[PDB]
């Protein structure tokens, strides 16, 4: 009782079911595999067939099949779903599998709309067919699975309401080369574009999601980092949300800083007005951030800042919590509490903490940043003024209340105030730090606005990029790279648009890029370190000085071409002050490596020419841009040998760089017996790290008395992070 | 062995050829401690 | 602090630039004793294409609710609380799910 059923092809004719395809697909992409099945694939597919199915529906079934076959046992078949997904890729933008030349192919997508029309006019046809030469189509066959996926989901330009994909994985790479040096002089671009396609290509340098998905479509924006500081004022409220609006609609993420707003009761206009209080206003935050941005890449995400001596803060501090009303929540948003030196001192001597509102107490909210003695002096003197409204509570109660919706919602975030100024790019009487971003690995200056347009107000950009510790070799490798990313990035800066004045002010002004590092837990491995034990902590203070040091001098040396930023006289490098000075003292006690560079050849330098960035490195967590070179993400130790990380189609597995050879080397993140070991690389790292770390503090229930998390351990190391110089704390993740 | 080295290419055949918080803190102890 | 008209009418156009514009707008004219009426009948709907399918248009309900916490920012405090009443055609696409935003029942989104 044979049927004979039909199958639909790609372009829309059909022939009889055959299912030698399928044969031939799966055991092209199982070659030079071990240990995988192109049996199992298709019986665990459970694909069923009816007359007139589409071939490409067969095809993304049998990718999703192989994907869940990703295991410790057998771990290549992470390649083999990856080459799968990297064919289905493939006919779905050309049509066949080879892709078309170079310069066809841009001129077809220009004309089309989805390239920027500046890629024609400033190139000719016989550069993009030498470019054409530089590409190497052959390494789309080093992805993992969660690694295509990535780019298909959200790197590859596509429509958003077609699903059409258009390009390839190496036309993305040459033409984000191609773009950045375009204002290059021809005598070099093209050197620079050929090296800075191999670095991205073979996984030396790693890209941003905006960088990714963004450098070579007509929207200009690339920035993943925007900061935004709201002054207490309608007109500076509105300013904030217009500009919120405008940077979420454009790939971005926000760290809002509204600490300035008075507290609730205080008198509006003399008293013809009842303050409503800043929970209404944070409202208004909130869906400013998630009005537009969720068609995009990624959906728009903030974090707001306040003082933790804020009159609000206990009402602050439970808006995640999803118990309650709703007039008292606002859970869409993150939140970082900022603390200084004074606010730990009143905890460990077990004495009060004294609420302001920002609006009754003039020049301690600036003196909070910049000065920590004029701190202690204005606060203790308000403390006593009867006068002034305040009110007391328990230091132990008040970090109580954070560290518990710290540890619930594991998205209420620490920034140590104090350290982000003493051991910052900046003079705190000229630029003060005042803020931090989503991730809480930026720091950089800022100045409320008075309209959208406000010319003197400052909204603080990042641009970032990291390098793979896992793809060098030897540390002065990391000189030729950090030339590669801080020129593309620094061009980059006079490359993108900006949509609010204020911010192009800072961008221009500053140029403060943010590069930090990806596959750290897969260095330590190589290595033969650990991170709970301290053995890594000379490694790391080696490698983070090279990571600094060669950053610098490429920036330096950029400065002697084209001029050191404008603003560079507000930088604490313009003083010949460097980070190997003003980091935290305790850290000589975790680490006896000496220094290896020339810093004061450096410094000379840098006095003289100046930094062509006000700041350089930054240590983003690189959540997904990591993915691409299946690295292990940032600073931080894989949850396992394969982890399961979010997509937009669904879960992925990742296995670890070189797990059949490294498996045992690896300090999984519940192998850890505690933060001390992490928190100790982290401060390490930050004596040389312009801006801060998104670290992240982990706690396993089952490894305290009683199955419970002791709010004793929380604050332990809460202290043992401030100890060591660690500027900001981000996730803490609690298992289960 | 007469044939080259081979891992299982039909896995699926051996299934059948076989049968809070602990919200106490201690002031004094952190106290104990160098900011 | 003289304003004492008390109706004040807002049309919104289809862009990010009138959106801005209008929110910022409705925050002055409540915190000054006045009632809003909002014209956002021009935004397009949800799933329409964005800068030629670059983005998907997260629809109406997104801005809707930006536009609900400008009312109620800061106002309360003063003689009475912000106010406003949103329009639009009966022959809008979300319309559907348009009528049912004052609804008890459902989800917050
Ligand atoms: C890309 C590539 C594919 N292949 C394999 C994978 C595919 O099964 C096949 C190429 O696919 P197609 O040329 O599309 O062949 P098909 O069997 O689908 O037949 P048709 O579309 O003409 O009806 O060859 C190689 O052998 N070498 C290669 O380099
Ligand atoms: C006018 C007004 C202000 N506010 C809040 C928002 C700001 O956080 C804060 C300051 O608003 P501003 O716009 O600074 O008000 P103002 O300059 O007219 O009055 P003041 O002398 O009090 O500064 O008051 C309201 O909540 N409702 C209102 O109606
Ligand atoms: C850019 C962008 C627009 N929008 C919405 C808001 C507006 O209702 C609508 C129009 O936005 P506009 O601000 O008009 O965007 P545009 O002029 O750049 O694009 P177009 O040519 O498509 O008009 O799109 C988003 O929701 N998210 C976004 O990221
Ligand atoms: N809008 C938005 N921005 C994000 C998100 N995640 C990260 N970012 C931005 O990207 C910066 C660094 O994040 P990172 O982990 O490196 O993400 P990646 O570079 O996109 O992989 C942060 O400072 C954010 O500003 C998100 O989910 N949404
Ligand atoms: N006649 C047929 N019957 C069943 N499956 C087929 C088939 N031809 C191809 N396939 C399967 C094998 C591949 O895994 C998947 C995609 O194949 P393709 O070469 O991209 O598409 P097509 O040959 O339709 O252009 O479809
Ligand atoms: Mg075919
Ligand atoms: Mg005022
Ligand atoms: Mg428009």
């Known amino acids: 009782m044979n049927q004979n059923l039909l199958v639909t092809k790609r372009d829309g004719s059909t022939e009889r079911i055959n299912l030698d395809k399928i044969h031939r697909v799966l055991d092209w992409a199982a070659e030079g595999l071990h240990n995988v099945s192109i049996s199992q694939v298709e019986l665990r597919s459970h694909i069923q067939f009816y007359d007139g199915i589409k071939t490409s529906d067969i095809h993304e079934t049998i990718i999703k099949a192989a994907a869940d076959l990703i295991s410790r046992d057998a771990p290549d078949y992470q390649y083999l779903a990856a080459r799968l997904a990297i064919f289905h890729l493939r006919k779905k933008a050309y049509g066949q599998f080879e892709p078309p030349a170079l310069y066809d192919h841009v001129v077809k997508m220009v004309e089309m709309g989805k390239y920027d029309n500046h890629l024609l006019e400033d190139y000719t046809e016989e550069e993009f067919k030498q470019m054409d030469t530089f590409i190497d189509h052959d390494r789309d066959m080093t992805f993992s699975y969660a690694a295509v996926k990535q780019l298909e989901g959200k790197y590859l330009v596509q429509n958003r309401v077609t699903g059409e994909i258009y390009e390839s994985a190496q036309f993305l790479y040459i033409l984000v080369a191609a773009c950045l040096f375009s204002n290059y002089p021809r005598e070099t671009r093209l050197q620079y574009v050929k090296r800075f396609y191999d670095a991205v290509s073979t996984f030396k340098i790693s890209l941003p999601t905006p960088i990714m998905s963004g450098v070579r479509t007509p929207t200009r924006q690339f920035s993943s980092c925007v900061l935004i500081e709201c002054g207490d004022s309608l007109d500076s409220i509105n300013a904030t949300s217009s500009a919120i609006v405008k940077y979420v609609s454009q790939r971005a993420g926000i760290g809002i800083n509204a600490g300035r707003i008075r507290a609730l009761g205080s008198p509006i206009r003399g008293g013809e007005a009842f303050h409503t209080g800043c929970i209404p206003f944070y409202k208004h935050f909130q869906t400013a951030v998630k009005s537009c941005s969720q ?442 | 062995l007469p044939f080259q080295t081979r891992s299982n290419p039909i896995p699926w055949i051996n299934t059948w050829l076989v049968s809070q918080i602990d919200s106490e803190v201690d002031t004094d102890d952190l106290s104990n401690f160098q900011l």
């Open chain 1, 295 to 736: 068609g995009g890449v990624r959906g728009g995400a903030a974090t707001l800042f306040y003082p933790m001596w804020h009159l609000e803060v206990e009402s602050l501090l439970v808006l995640k919590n999803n118990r309650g009303v709703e007039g008292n929540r606002v859970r869409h948003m993150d939140y970082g509490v900022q603390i200084n030196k004074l606010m730990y001192t009143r905890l460990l001597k077990g004495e009060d903490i004294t609420l302001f509102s920002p609006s009754d107490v003039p020049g301690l909210y600036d003196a909070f940043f910049a000065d920590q003695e004029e701190f202690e002096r204005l606060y203790t003197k308000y403390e006593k003024d009867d006068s002034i409204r305040k009110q007391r509570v328990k230091a132990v109660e008040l970090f109580s209340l954070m560290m518990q919706e710290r540890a619930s919602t594991g998205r209420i975030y620490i920034q140590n105030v104090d350290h982000c100024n003493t051991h910052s790019p900046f003079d705190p009487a000229i630029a003060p730090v005042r803020q931090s971003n989503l991730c809480l690995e930026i720091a950089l200056p800022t100045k409320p606005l008075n309209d959208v347009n406000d010319e003197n107000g400052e909204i603080a950009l990042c641009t970032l990029s990291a390098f793979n510790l896992g793809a060098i070799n030897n540390l002065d490798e990391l000189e030729e790279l950090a030339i590669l990313a801080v020129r593309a990035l620094d061009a980059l800066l006079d490359y993108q648009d900006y949509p609010i004045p204020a911010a192009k002010r800072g961008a221009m002004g500053r140029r403060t890029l943010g590069i930090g590092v990806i596959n750290f837990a897969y260095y330590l491995a190589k290595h033969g370190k650990r991170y709970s034990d301290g053995s890594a902590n000379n490694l790391t203070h080696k490698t983070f000085e090279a990571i600094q040091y060669y950053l610098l001098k490429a920036s330096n040396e950029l400065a002697k071409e084209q001029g050191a930023c404008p603003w560079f006289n507000e930088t604490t490098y313009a003083k010949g002050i460097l980070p190997i000075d003003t980091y935290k003292k305790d850290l000589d006690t975790i680490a006896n490596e000496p220094l290896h560079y020339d810093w004061e050849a450096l410094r000379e330098s840098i006095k003289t020419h100046g930094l062509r960035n006000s700041t350089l490195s930054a240590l983003m967590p690189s959540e997904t841009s990591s993915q691409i070179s299946n690295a292990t993400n940032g600073i931080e130790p894989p949850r396992g040998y394969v982890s399961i990380k979010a997509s937009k189609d669904g879960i992925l597995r990742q296995v670890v760089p070189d797990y059949e050879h490294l498996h045992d080397a690896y300090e999984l993140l519940w192998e850890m017996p505690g933060n001390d070991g992490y928190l100790q690389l982290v401060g390490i790292m930050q004596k040389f790290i312009d801006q801060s770390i998104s670290a992240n503090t982990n706690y396993d229930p089952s490894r305290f008395p009683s199955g419970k998390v002791p709010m004793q351990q929380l604050l332990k190391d809460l202290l043992t992070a401030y100890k060591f110089g660690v500027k900001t704390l981000y996730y803490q993740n609690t298992r289960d």
